[PDB]
Design a binder for this molecule. Structure first.
Ligand code: CL
Ligand code: CL
Ligand code: CL
Length: 163
C-alpha cells in the first residue's frame, strides 16, 4: 500500500503516467478504439491480447511486468440513464478489485464514460463520484488523468473538498 494513500489529478496523456499500473477506458471488444484507448494501444499494444470483456467489468493484461487494467464503461448512447449509471459504478468496483489483487502502490485512472461514451452529456461529477465510491477502500495512490483545464480545476476542487 502507499504510506499515506492520496488522490491527485494531472492534465496530461495517461500514456505518460508515473504510476505502477494504468486503467484503460476500453471498448468491450479489445479494439484499439480512439482517445485514451488509442493512446494506451500505441504505448502498450501487447496488453490487447485477449483484452475483450463485457460492459461493467475490468480485465488485466500484462505488458511485460506493467499491468493494463481494461475497464469497460457503458456507452450512454445505448444504455438508459439508470442502467448506464449501474454499469459505470460496477466498472469502477471491478477496477478496485484488480488494483487490490495486483498489490500495486499506485494507479493512473481516466474518468470512464466522460468522452465518446458520454451520450453528449457532462458526466464529470457522476463518473468521479463512482471512482471515489470504489477506490476509497483501497490503499493505492490514485492519480486521475484528464485533458481539459476546466475539468482539471473541478476534479482538484472535488478532491480538496473531502480533505
Ligand atoms: Cl501530455
Ligand atoms: Cl469515454
Ligand atoms: Cl478531460
Amino acid at each position: 500500500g502507499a504510506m499515506a494513500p492520496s488522490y491527485r489529478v494531472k492534465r496530461m496523456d495517461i500514456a505518460k503516467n508515473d504510476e505502477e499500473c494504468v486503467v484503460n477506458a476500453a471498448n468491450p471488444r479489445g479494439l484499439p478504439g480512439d482517445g485514451v484507448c488509442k493512446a494506451v494501444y500505441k504505448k502498450w499494444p501487447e496488453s490487447f491480447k485477449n483484452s475483450a470483456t463485457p460492459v461493467g467489468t475490468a480485465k488485466t493484461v500484462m505488458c511485460g511486468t506493467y499491468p493494463v487494467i481494461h475497464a469497460v464503461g457503458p456507452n450512454f448512447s445505448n444504455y438508459t440513464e439508470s442502467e448506464g449509471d449501474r454499469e459505470l459504478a460496477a466498472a469502477y468496483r471491478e477496477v478496485a478489485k484488480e488494483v487490490t489483487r495486483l498489490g500495486v502502490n499506485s494507479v493512473a485512472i481516466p474518468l470512464l464514460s466522460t468522452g465518446v461514451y458520454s451520450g453528449g452529456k457532462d458526466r464529470l461529477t457522476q463518473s468521479l463520484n463512482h471512482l471515489f465510491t470504489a477506490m476509497d477502500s483501497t490503499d493505492a495512490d490514485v492519480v486521475i488523468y484528464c485533458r481539459d483545464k476546466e475539468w482539471e480545476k473541478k476534479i482538484s476542487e472535488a478532491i480538496q473538498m473531502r480533505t
